[PDB]
Amino acid sequence: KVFERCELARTLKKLGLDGYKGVSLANWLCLTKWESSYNTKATNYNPSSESTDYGIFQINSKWWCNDGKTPNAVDGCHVSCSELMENDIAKAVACAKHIVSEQGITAWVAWKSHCRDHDVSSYVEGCTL
Template sequence: MRSILIISLLSCFFAAHNAKVFSKCELAHKLKAQGMDGFHGYNLANWVCMAQYESDFNTQVVNKKNANGSSDYGLFQLNNKWWCKDNKYPSANACNIMCSKFLDDDINDDIRCIKRVVRDPNRMSAWKAWVSHCKNKDLSQYLAGCNL
């Protein structure tokens, strides 16, 4: 019993260790370094706004409440029906990656995938939170004070 408790506590520690919650400016700098400013016509503020409303900048968020039974993973809430594979739901896996890779603090693979998503016909409208909260809005607040 004691060893199960120790293993459980260690598992929680390692899971928390891999979690990352970005600040808006930290994320903006990372996205800029990865060429996202102006990528397919979307400036950094669009990406930062979308991430805030999708995950509140938290890499460990998993949304399992989609009406079709699919789930969304990570900072950019990438869906297991279209973009990644989780062995729980049939997937097109267009980003050719396991969904669990979107839950760690290394967002380079997440960025590669969002570049793939935005090349599709839906572009940024693939993210409902972006449509509801960011599209055609003044997004200057998302980069304010970031010294970009």
């Protein structure tokens, strides 16, 4: 599923991400924009660790989900990487909560590069929340 921005905003808020461990909704919307363009089926190969980033949060297979093919890997979220690409982002959100709790918001390099020290208020512009 590719989300519209405000549709995603509403979904992330319903799933308890607004302010979760100090990360505002608009920050999550900026992160997911730059990571995946709001596409739940986004994938990107990471040759540095021969791994793949999956779904709207671009969660990596070396650490956080099982995909079988990744060498020297663990499954921190106890989930198949496929489940992090479901149209229903519930499992993806649960795993993001785990990641941010364990490693902090800086776990997402895309957030550091595009969102940190930027005004991200525009991500909720025109959304009913």
